[PDB]
């Protein structure tokens, strides 16, 4: 009786930023049009990004009202927090209402709430704010995951699994929401990492309902969460770093991140599937939701696992249409996979396959995997 | 087969601040000796604090080097974080080594880590840093609880229970560590709440090992974690608020917090025990670890539950000797209770009693309770 995903909902801010237009926007609104060297580099990064558009809360009017946000290193955490501590729970609410609708049960039936964000921090937290917005029972059992980073879309499934399986009848609402206003920085030739985040990072929220023992013909499972594993990739502490500072949430990204992922993927996949089956796996027999931290990460997974053409289509589709939204992204990918599987008349939510995996990748470097089974479409 | 607490260790910074000396220290080092108005108020708060001493990482030299820390509202987050992001995992390490020693198993048997702190935030987090310091397996399954606040000493037991019970053979290291350097603020009559935190808040770390199915040749359970409940007290959102700002971690404390706790304690205790056996009265039959957010909270729990003289001795002892260290405090209280029970020749780690409760109280206001059973002290 494993925990099952019973619903997935998603949301994004309303403002669409097409990648073709973003270099012009960024350099204009941050008053850096004279930095033609930085512009050419940013153009090359955007060309390689495999991201066509992103949704962002941030607007030009907000930058005009708060120019410290684009003035590299200026004190600006307070204004960023004033925005994100409100907008993160609100975007989470939208996704949650969609998940709850799909699930089809009353909000009063939710017993547990997991809220995850790397975009803000406050006491009481986003979980408390979401309880107020949704009218959740005031005695819901909460887990508030602040500042974990991009592996957490897998981690929250692992946590939901344990809560759902160890508490008879529990129904866990899981909400991941990101608003990257807190991570927006201006341009300096001394901190080129910012060009990569400026090209890739995006806003979005996901919500998932998890429960064990779904009610036959009443709840409709989408995926089963079978087993999970979290690990730290050796010698990679510098891979992804983010610090909570007076200037906002500052970050550093090593160019070696993709190679670290590629150098460990066989191992972490093997060790994960050992928790289920003693037989060796054929990686092409699986469906995949891979956190698309950037396009090179996706390429490394494909290469080192020997994946066939098109195996990572759902992952690449989400990166293209939404960018890297952090923890929610792998949930967008599972939703996309389910929806494409319906479109194509596949027999299961996992592209017609039985077994699959979610791969979250973030600071440490830390990788969390969740082994899934699909469910029948009919 | 419920999750058991198999070990408890604790640690504090080395610098001891006796409460009798703290007003003089605070007003001198923050250059506020002219504020005799605030000194009078602070003396009254310290007299009522029921706190005899506290351990603090912060020193006068740090304040002299970083006077923005005591300049109310000045930018200082970065220097605070530079301190706490290092000191929090280090203090946690000290507590963890003590817990691991008691537990008696190799560190390689630890499968899960929960780290909790409200004193800092970073990516990678304190959990990652503690893994490095201790040499935990790189594949430990982690939960990093940042900025939950004062209910979390109960919450982490609830989380550890689910992880330990759902993952067969799991052994969960739980570390809660607080360094209040991030919360230290200077003095203004526009934010009098700071006088309360200045009197009560303190530094410390706890470590607890949690597992189901204890290994008879090695492990010795102290408590069993039976059932847990978390709830929000109505109409109390202003009770405890803390914001992460350029000036550090700012906080507000409503004077009505004790009244909210007293007005809800019978209800939250009753609803908690509904998960066990339906207990509704005769609360003196239990042992207690109550988060001593301040002395008035302790007094309200005692009064409204009708607790007899001495029932909350362990709670009051920890408040007296350590102050309010945040989430770890209820674990210090369980450790004290175990210690005193040994000293007195009690039959169990819970003052001879069978059933007890941990009560954590923090922002929301949120109350998390954990119902415990004690374990035999063998003889
Ligand atoms: C799309 C890129 C960035 C570039 O495409 P490629 O196929 O590699 O093509 P190229 O080799 O032509 O490179 C083009 C130019 O880019 C430059 N450059 C590249 N990397 C860097 C770098 N780190 N730092 C500085 N510069 C860099 C490179 O030098 C070159 O410069 P030139 O043209 O010669 O002047 C790809 O490497 C990728 O997906 N990387 C993974 C991103 C990643 O780690 N994501 C996950 C972590 S996100 C996270 O945890 C988080 C999320 C939210 C908040 C907080 C935290
Ligand atoms: C020990 C006290 C503070 C005072 O003893 P009592 O028996 O009440 O004696 P009195 O009534 O004579 O009061 C003396 C004077 O103090 C004053 N005053 C009192 N309260 C306040 C106040 N809020 N705000 C401003 N002033 C206040 C009061 O007005 C009086 O002033 P005067 O003398 O007339 O000029 C007791 O009320 C207590 O335990 N409170 C619970 C503290 C609490 O909520 N803890 C939990 C949250 S910790 C947390 O979440 C956290 C932890 C770490 C980091 C971040 C967050």
């Amino acid at each position: 009786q494993h925990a099952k995903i019973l619903a997935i909902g998603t949301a994004n801010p309303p403002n669409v930023y097409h990648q073709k237009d973003y270099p012009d926007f960024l350099f204009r609104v941050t008053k850096n049009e004279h930095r033609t060297d930085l512009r050419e580099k940013f153009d090359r990064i955007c060309e390689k990004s495999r991201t066509k558009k992103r949704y962002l809360h941030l607007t030009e009017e907000m930058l005009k009202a708060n120019p410290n946000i684009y003035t590299y290193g200026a004190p600006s955490l307070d204004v960023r927090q004033d925005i994100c501590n409100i907008e993160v729970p609100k975007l989470g609410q939208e996704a949650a209402l969609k998940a709850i609708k799909e699930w089809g049960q009353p909000i009063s039936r939710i017993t547990h709430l997991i809220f995850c964000t790397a975009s803000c921090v406050d006491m009481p937290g986003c979980d408390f704010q979401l309880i107020k917005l949704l009218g959740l029972d005031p005695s819901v059992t909460r887990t508030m995951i602040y500042e974990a980073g991009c592996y957490a879309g897998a981690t929250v499934l692992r946590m939901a699994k344990d809560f759902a399986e160890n508490n008879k009848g529990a129904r866990v609402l899981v909400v991941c929401a990101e608003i990257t206003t807190v991570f927006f920085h201006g341009l300096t030739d001394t901190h080129l990492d910012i060009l990569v985040g400026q090209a890739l990072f995006a806003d979005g929220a996901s919500a998932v309902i998890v429960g064990a023992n779904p009610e036959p013909e009443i709840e409709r499972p989408l995926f089963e969460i079978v087993a999970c594993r979290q690990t730290i990739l050796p010698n990679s502490e510098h891979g992804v770093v983010a610090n909570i500072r007076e200037m906002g949430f500052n970050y550093y990204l090593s160019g070696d991140v993709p190679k670290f992922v590629g150098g460990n993927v066989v191992d972490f996949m093997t060790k994960t599937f050992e928790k289920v089956d003693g037989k060796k796996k054929d990686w092409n027999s699986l469906f995949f939701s891979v956190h698309p931290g950037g396009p090179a990460i996706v390429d490394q997974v494909e290469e080192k696992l020997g994946l066939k053409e098109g195996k990572l289509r759902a992952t690449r589709h989400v990166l293209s249409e939404y960018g890297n939204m952090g923890a929610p992204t792998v949930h967008f990918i599972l939703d996309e996979m389910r929806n494409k599987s319906i479109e194509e008349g596949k027999t299961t939510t996992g592209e017609g396959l039985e077994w699959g995996v979610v791969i979250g990748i973030g600071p440490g470097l830390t990788v969390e995997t969740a082994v899934l089974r699909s469910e029948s479409i009919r």
Side-chain angles (χ1 to χ4, degrees), chain A:
Chain A
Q1 300 169 344
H2 289 133
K4 311 275 181 125
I5 292 173
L6 304 179
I8 306 168
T10 69
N12 306 88
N15 318 118
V16 193
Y17 289 81
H18 301 278
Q19 196 76 312
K20 68 175 177 268
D21 305 316
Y22 194 78
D24 280 339
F25 172 83
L26 177 61
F27 277 73
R28 181 177 61 76
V29 303
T30 68
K31 317 295 196 183
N32 279 307
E33 295 182 344
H34 60 292
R35 297 302 310 270
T36 50
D37 53 337
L38 294 181
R39 174 58 183 267
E40 284 176 3
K41 191 173 194 94
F42 190 59
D43 284 337
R44 291 193 298 274
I45 290 166
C46 288
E47 296 161 18
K48 290 274 197 176
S49 70
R50 306 283 301 275
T51 298
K52 181 175 75 180
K53 68 184 181 22
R54 292 173 286 165
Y55 301 88
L56 304 170
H57 174 74
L58 189 60
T59 61
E60 178 171 2
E61 282 311 309
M62 289 169 52
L63 290 173
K64 289 165 69 171
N66 305 278
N68 272 15
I69 292 175
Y70 67 79
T71 302
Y72 183 89
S76 64
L77 177 67
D78 294 347
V79 295
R80 296 164 192 271
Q81 287 264 76
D82 288 347
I83 293 164
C84 297
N85 282 325
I86 294 297
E87 298 300 330
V88 165
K90 181 169 161 175
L91 191 67
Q93 172 190 20
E94 182 185 339
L97 287 169
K98 294 170 177 180
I100 292 161
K101 177 188 179 184
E102 171 178 4
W103 179 38
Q105 298 292 313
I107 290 178
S108 60
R109 184 63 184 81
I110 294 166
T111 59
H112 289 71
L113 171 62
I114 303 176
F115 201 111
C116 173
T117 186
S119 294
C120 61
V121 56
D122 200 32
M123 302 171 67
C126 296
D127 61 317
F128 177 88
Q129 300 302 345
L130 188 69
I131 289 163
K132 290 169 54 186
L133 288 168
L134 292 176
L136 290 169
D137 189 315
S139 301
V140 287
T141 295
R142 299 130 62 190
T143 300
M144 178 66 250
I145 302 303
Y146 275 128
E147 285 72 63
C150 283
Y151 53 84
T155 302
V156 295
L157 297 179
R158 175 256 292 177
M159 292 173 177
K161 173 184 172 65
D162 285 343
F163 303 155
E165 290 176 1
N166 203 52
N167 295 278
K168 185 175 175 185
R171 291 288 183 271
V172 187
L173 173 60
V174 181
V175 176
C176 296
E178 298 295 341
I179 299 281
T180 61
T181 289
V182 75
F183 291 106
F184 185 104
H185 300 286
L187 312 178
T188 176
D189 52 32
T190 64
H191 191 179
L192 296 172
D193 314 50
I194 297 307
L195 298 180
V196 174
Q198 284 283 1
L200 289 170
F201 297 168
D203 299 356
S206 62
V208 184
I209 295 276
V210 177
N213 310 293
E215 304 312 305
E217 294 325 293
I218 297 176
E219 292 172 304
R220 297 180 273 185
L222 303 179
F223 300 97
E224 180 185 343
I225 311 164
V226 178
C228 305
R229 185 176 169 270
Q230 190 175 38
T231 199
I232 293 160
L233 309 188
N235 307 122
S236 69
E237 176 175 354
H238 61 291
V240 176
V241 171
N243 313 130
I244 292 72
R245 304 301 277 182
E246 295 159 28
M247 64 182 279
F249 290 14
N250 196 23
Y251 61 89
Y252 298 93
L253 308 173
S254 175
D256 281 343
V257 171
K259 288 195 301 184
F260 279 123
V261 173
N264 285 273
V265 64
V266 172
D267 188 70
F268 69 66
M269 287 291 294
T270 298
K271 295 286 201 301
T272 296
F273 276 86
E274 282 171 6
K275 293 187 77 174
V276 175
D277 172 35
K279 293 192 183 172
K280 71 178 161 147
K281 300 299 302 187
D282 175 356
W283 308 125
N284 278 299
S285 73
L286 302 179
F287 62 91
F288 288 83
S289 175
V290 181
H291 178 66
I297 288 171
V298 179
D299 290 342
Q300 288 281 340
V301 171
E302 177 179 77
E303 180 175 69
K304 269 77 172 177
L305 297 182
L307 303 184
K308 70 183 94 175
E309 186 179 358
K311 178 58 69 170
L312 301 185
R313 181 213 68 81
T315 294
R316 295 181 191 282
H317 180 78
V318 169
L319 178 58
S320 182
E321 295 294 337
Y322 300 94
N324 172 3
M325 298 168 288
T329 313
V330 289
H331 308 146
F332 279 72
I333 295 164
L334 290 170
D335 198 22
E336 165 60 23
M337 180 177 295
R338 167 264 293 272
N339 203 49
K340 189 76 168 173
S341 294
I342 291 167
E343 178 196 283
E344 293 176 336
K346 299 292 202 268
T347 59
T348 79
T349 53
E351 309 183 329
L353 300 172
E354 183 59 29
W355 292 93
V357 67
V358 181
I359 307 173
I361 306 160
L365 295 171
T366 295
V367 173
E368 186 130 22
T369 49
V371 176
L372 304 182
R373 295 170 75 154
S374 65
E375 298 287 351
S376 176
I377 284 177
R378 300 174 76 72

